[PDB]
Write a protein that binds this DNA or RNA. Structure first.
Ligand code: K
Ligand code: K
Ligand code: K
Ligand code: MG
Ligand code: MG
Length: 136
RNA sequence: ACAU
DNA sequence: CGATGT
């Protein structure tokens, strides 16, 4: 603790895992939805969590914002730190879209800089992250 | 185990 | 109950 209220919170939503994946980012303080990705027909939870963080980085950089990003995903936070999404999802025609987006997110990380702190949302202490989809 |  | 991850 405590929550850094001046921040952006992101989360994934899915129908199946693997399954249809979407994500959104919200203002932690107000819950205002700031971006939402169009559903991707097949992906994993962790790919979506990773894309959500990287999109948040790009969103904040474009707006000259130094706010931190909260994510509840230990996995995706590490993948962003490493600049490498170590997903097990098969690469085939059905998964080509998500894998293109993941590849492109890695490429952006490898060609840009940021100081944005990427923080673990402490669900056990604080309840669900403010960007949660309410599907569980 | 822990995080989803 | 199933799956994705460190
Ligand atoms: K949910
Ligand atoms: K959660
Ligand atoms: K497991
Ligand atoms: Mg999540
Ligand atoms: Mg959630």
């Amino acid at each position: 603790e405590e929550i850094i209220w001046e921040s952006l919170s992101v989360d994934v939503g899915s129908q199946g895992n693997p399954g249809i994946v979407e994500y959104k980012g919200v203002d932690t303080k107000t819950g205002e939805v700031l971006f939402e990705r169009e559903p991707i027909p097949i992906g994993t939870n962790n790919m979506g969590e990773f894309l959500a963080i990287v999109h948040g980085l790009r969103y904040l950089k474009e707006r000259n914002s130094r706010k931190p990003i909260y994510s509840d995903s230990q996995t995706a936070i590490k993948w962003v730190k490493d600049k490498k999404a170590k997903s097990t999802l098969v690469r085939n025609e059905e998964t080509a879209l998500i894998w293109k987006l993941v590849d492109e997110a890695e490429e952006w990380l490898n060609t840009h800089t940021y100081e944005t702190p990427i923080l673990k949302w402490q669900t056990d202490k604080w309840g669900e992250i403010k960007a949660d989809y309410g599907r569980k």
